[PDB]
Design a protein around this ligand. Structure first.
Ligand SMILES: Nc1ncnc2c1ncn2[C@@H]1O[C@H](COP(=O)(O)OP(=O)(O)O)[C@@H](O)[C@H]1O
Ligand SMILES: Nc1ncnc2c1ncn2[C@@H]1O[C@H](COP(=O)(O)OP(=O)(O)O)[C@@H](O)[C@H]1O
Ligand SMILES: Nc1ncnc2c1ncn2[C@@H]1O[C@H](COP(=O)(O)OP(=O)(O)O)[C@@H](O)[C@H]1O
Lengths: 746, 497
């Protein structure tokens, strides 16, 4: 059916007037990448561009960027034709001119600096009316081709002349500003962004289509998470890209005025959104407008809450507006807000992971001239506790430090600042290090919800335990049909018991990483904090966070911490049950197995935990994590030493055979000792080398040589002389008798 | 609407209430419905604002005026009956309170069928399976589930089919069909279950789901059905029927299933308060939760109020002898008070399960509350065989299995330990099937053969090898000392205290 028309999609290449298509549809149209091809678009405009054949994009879909789609006056989902134009010409002088106020506050011969390198050896095909763009010097500016000596479209040549003159002319009212937030500006919430897309695509992109059917739309979205995680940014980008009218309802803006005035403002905003259907209503800081009903002290606040409820119900009965909200916690807002019909679906924006932090940093450094030493992978891996706007402030601090290092020290009395000095600014790694260390407050202190970077290779030994855990986790989620075929409900929990230091935490992290599932590790400090604070209800939202991050591995490190603080083996005269452990049991009983949220518990004292947690259906699998043997210790050493550069003279098998009954974390402490001795040796060698030659006044005397870049066997031998037996043999006997008593108990 | 009422000015809110009541009186017979009544009428000690109290009083006066001269029936909606002002529930104002409650599996099935009445859904929907799987979803939750399934179907069809061909018409939209995958995705990824409190429903566990304990089954059938199925016989004799029974014995013998099956046989709702709930009420120092627990049980008459792990509080507050304190507990005390305040005629039966009957307070064993101490013994050969037959009815098992032999190996094994035996063996079968599937997938991918498919199921059932491996893995159920303690407690049913 006319394999000429074709549908739109996003793009990867950053070059302008460039495309890519699937590999098979290159003979269907019978033209290759170099073939300059024209494409059609509404308002009767057609633009020529280079072509390419890629793979990712489907046969029915094209790839391009805003630079071209704007002049084409076309959006996504739309469809266009295509035709090869080998008749293109090596164009001669083709007049251009900057079309914007971007030129505001600029100097220097922009012509050369900005254009020549872009037009360098490009043969960038051009057609009159183009709005191509170029960026530099912490700025970005575009130019329109007003004239094509040959018309309508031609090729550029390095020989062609440029008599480029004139003054900045104005963007006709048909031009669309790119200031609107876009999905390219969202990072760290890719899953959340996809969820929002699938929620709001039908109500907004297809209003009449949804009006034809009689289904209930999602008209309430609760974006909850830490402040600064881009909730309003996500809402603005979604509304702008989908074309929905965005109204920024601010809680402080709402209830800043009089009570009657606040209600009138809310009603006017809702009426305007209804008039501009399809529209998106976003209410950031919804907890300010709508607190808990028992907590809202002022009658004015309750009246405002009720007015908002009535307005959103009126939207529900007769409107086409999707309401979005932002809050720190879902429970901080009124429970009546989350009532069905009002706020049906709550999206946990959450925190960005290492990949998410990398994406956010890349987004914020897109227009920032940054050096090659930035290694944003390393920054993101190091970055912890920073969410969204925290990384934005980090990038701003790095840029400001670079500017204060350059401007405040270079251009003082020479001559007034011009564009040349500002566009030459570069951001280095030292600026990012300083931003990380001295000038960044991490606003994140609660539980981390991310896919851990620890893999199976990061764990040594425990192959049988690895396989059993792989079964118990992957098989329910990777082969649900097999479990459904048999009459057995998959287990939703496992308990890890054994000597401390055997890697139960890494086991949970690796099983979460293998399934690409988020891991929420609640260590013993968190359990004891909830127990001592008499706040067992925190387990409720912990399990809610775990469920919202499905698939998730809900790890409870040091599950016996409360049982150990409330006495030792026999302890006080009380029993073994604990309030926080009890809340964990209640949540697990209330947790559906299908939710593919797995609970892993690590206990260094399995005998002191309450047997109620060992009842079938909660933690029926008691996986014993034994003290590593020779092969396991060798594998642990291999996994640990993969990071620290170690000399080949090291003998890991011999080191393991000396270490009788040593735990994995005790082997990492062995590296702590030996690797730290190597670091100290390097530092002392550096300082003595610095001090020795400073006495001799020699202009050229540099015997530069690295003392040692690796760790030799001497450091490991010193660690052996320092580090000693891992744990008492009595503890190992207790663990082995507990393993022997897996049954015939209670 | 409560928000609609108190959204306006205080005088304006009162005027709106008066106008609504006057219009309802004019349109008699009329129904006044006040959803979110707790918003209009909170607890009297809790309503901070004077405007809110004035609105509460205005509503009270308007409904009293309806009572004296009108023909209007007033209905109200609230999360909890106690969340509203107690003066609202005064006789003459709100005489009868209807507990809407939560839908059961059949109720969820009915709701799904209602919401799919106008929805073109495929034959693979198997809404029985969805409803049986659906837990924690109530009403509008299932409505949102159906909406999510429909929206996923639309986003799969419309967003991928009709892009540049031609404008949408009725033919493409009426051809839309909802599949099972959409319902699975709605269940898993895009549905928040708003239910976390106690479940009030008729359990699906029947007598056939329990193996053995025939004498216990008959005794429980008597103690429950006979007061409610033959009230005339009990009234003829001068004996008040018992309103409670205690189940004591080794854990894993199916006391929970006994309560569920006796609730199902009478078609009575079962509210199972497990040990976690009792310990939550004890640790939180909120013993008053037992009050509304018993209120929910009474409102669901006939009901079997099951208290699983009734010794959980007595076990957390020390072991056998424990601390220097006694055996009575605040939550157990509230349970005793509620049972003493519960009329037997209300046909609300209380069942208590204790794995440590010796640590519970004897005050709960006083006649009139839990006078019947039914011992749930460790299953013998016949009971174990029946338990295995009941459990294996769900998991497809090969006929080569020898349940009598398996029971005769399992000396002194509890029923839940036999279900753990299936956990082991049936899981080994599942793992064998999965590994066979993956190795079959991997083996032929090397050969570039256009047509080479030796399709055959590895094993659809569970063979005796899996059960033998489970026997090599699973071991003795419980210590013999515990069984001796249970048998001596049974021997000391009398001549104590
Ligand atoms: N995930 C993110 N990706 C990119 N930028 C972000 C992200 N989160 C926050 N920001 C940046 O933070 C700034 C303001 O954050 P904001 O969205 O107001 O925080 P909140 O979500 O609390 O409203 C924005 O200019 C935006 O660029
Ligand atoms: N088997 C193992 N293989 C590799 N690394 C390990 C192993 N066991 C422990 N480690 C590492 O050594 C350290 C000590 O382990 P630890 O966390 O105490 O174990 P656990 O969490 O079981 O108590 C940890 O930081 C962990 O990263
Ligand atoms: N006699 C029995 N017949 C059939 N199934 C049983 C029996 N006893 C227990 N089960 C099942 O095996 C599991 C273990 O029983 P459990 O619940 O521990 O018993 P109890 O509630 O008496 O402690 C339960 O999930 C139950 O469904």
């Amino acid at each position: 059916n006319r394999p000429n028309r074709l549908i739109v999609d996003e793009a990867i290449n950053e070059d302008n007037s460039v495309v890519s298509l699937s590999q098979p549809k290159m003979d269907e149209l019978q033209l290759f990448r170099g073939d300059t091809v024209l494409l059609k678009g509404k308002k009767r405009r057609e633009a020529v561009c280079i072509v390419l054949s890629d793979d990712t994009c489907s046969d029915e879909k094209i790839r391009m960027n805003r630079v071209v789609r704007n002049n084409l006056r076309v959006r996504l989902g739309d469809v266009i034709s295509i035709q090869p134009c080998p008749d293109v010409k090596y164009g001669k002088r083709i007049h251009v001119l900057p079309i914007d106020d971007t030129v505001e506050g600029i100097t220097g011969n922009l012509f050369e600096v900005y254009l020549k390198p872009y037009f360098l050896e490009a043969y960038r095909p051009i057609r009159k009316g183009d709005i191509f763009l170029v960026r530099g010097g912490m700025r970005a500016v575009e130019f329109k081709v007003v004239e094509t000596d040959p018309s309508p479209y031609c090729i550029v040549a390095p020989d062609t002349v440029i008599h480029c003159e004139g003054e900045p002319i104005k963007r006709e009212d048909e031009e669309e500003s790119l200031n609107e937030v876009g999905y390219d500006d969202i990072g760290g919430c890719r899953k959340q962004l996809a969820q929002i897309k699938e929620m709001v695509e039908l109500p907004l992109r297809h209003p009449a289509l949804f009006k034809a059917i009689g289904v209930k739309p999602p008209r309430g979205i609760l974006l909850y998470g830490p402040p600064g995680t881009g909730k309003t940014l996500i809402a603005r980008a979604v509304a702008n890209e989908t074309g929905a009218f965005f109204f920024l309802i601010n809680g402080p803006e709402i209830m800043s005025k009089l009570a009657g005035e606040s209600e009138s403002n809310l009603r006017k905003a809702f009426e305007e959104a209804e008039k501009n259907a399809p529209a998106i209503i976003f209410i950031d800081e919804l907890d300010a407008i709508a607190p808990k009903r028992e907590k809202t002290h002022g009658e004015v606040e309750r009246r405002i809450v009720s007015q908002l409820l009535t307005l959103m119900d009126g939207l529900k009965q007769r409107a086409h507006v999707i309401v979005m909200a932002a809050t720190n916690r879902p429970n901080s807002i009124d429970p009546a807000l989350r009532r069905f019909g009002r706020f049906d679906r709550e999206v946990d924006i959450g925190i960005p992971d290492a990949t998410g932090r990398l994406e956010i940093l890349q987004i914020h450094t897109k227009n920032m001239k940054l050096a090659d030493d930035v290694d944003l992978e390393q920054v993101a891996n190091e970055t912890h506790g920073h969410v969204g706007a925290d990384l934005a402030a980090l990038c701003s601090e790095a840029a400001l430090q670079a500017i204060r290092k350059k401007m405040d020290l270079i251009d003082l009395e020479d001559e007034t600042i011009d564009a040349e000095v500002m566009n030459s600014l570069a951001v280095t790694m030292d600026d990012f290090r300083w931003a990380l260390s001295q000038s960044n407050p991490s606003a994140l202190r609660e539980t981390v919800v991310e896919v851990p970077q620890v893999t199976w290779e990061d764990i040594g030994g425990l192959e049988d335990v690895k396989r059993e855990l792989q079964e118990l986790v992957q098989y329910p989620v990777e082969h649900p049909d097999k479990f459904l075929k048999f009459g057995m409900t998959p287990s939703k929990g496992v308990l890890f018991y054994g000597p401390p230091g055997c890697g139960k935490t890494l086991l949970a992290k690796a099983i979460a990483n293998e399934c690409q599932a988020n891991a929420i590790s609640i260590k013993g400090p968190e359990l004891l904090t909830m127990w001592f604070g008499e706040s067992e209800a925190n387990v409720r939202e912990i399990f809610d966070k775990a469920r919202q991050a499905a698939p998730c591995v809900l790890f409870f490190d040091e599950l016996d911490s409360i049982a150990k603080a409330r006495g030792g083996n026999i302890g006080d005269g009380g029993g073994a049950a604990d309030r926080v452990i009890n809340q964990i049991l209640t949540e697990m009983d209330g947790m559906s197995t299908k939710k593919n949220v797995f609970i892993i518990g690590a206990t260094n004292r399995p005998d002191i935990i309450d047997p109620a947690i060992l009842r079938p259906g909660r933690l029926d699998q008691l996986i014993y994590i034994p003290l590593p043997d020779e092969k396991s210790r060798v594998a642990i050493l291999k996994a640990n030493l993969r990071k620290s550069p170690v000399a080949k003279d090291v003998d890991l098998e011999f080191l393991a055979k000396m270490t009788n009954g040593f735990s994995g974390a005790d082997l990492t402490e062995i590296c702590q000792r030996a690797c730290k001795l190597a670091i100290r040796e390097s530092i002392e060698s550096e300082i003595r080398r610095e001090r020795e030659r400073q006495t001799n006044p020699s202009a050229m005397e540099v015997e530069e040589d690295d003392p040692v870049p690796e760790i030799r066997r001497d450091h490991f031998e010193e660690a052996m002389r320092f580090a000693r037996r891992s744990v008492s043999d009595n503890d190992i006997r207790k663990y082995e008798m507990f393993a022997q008593t897996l049954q015939q108990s209670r």
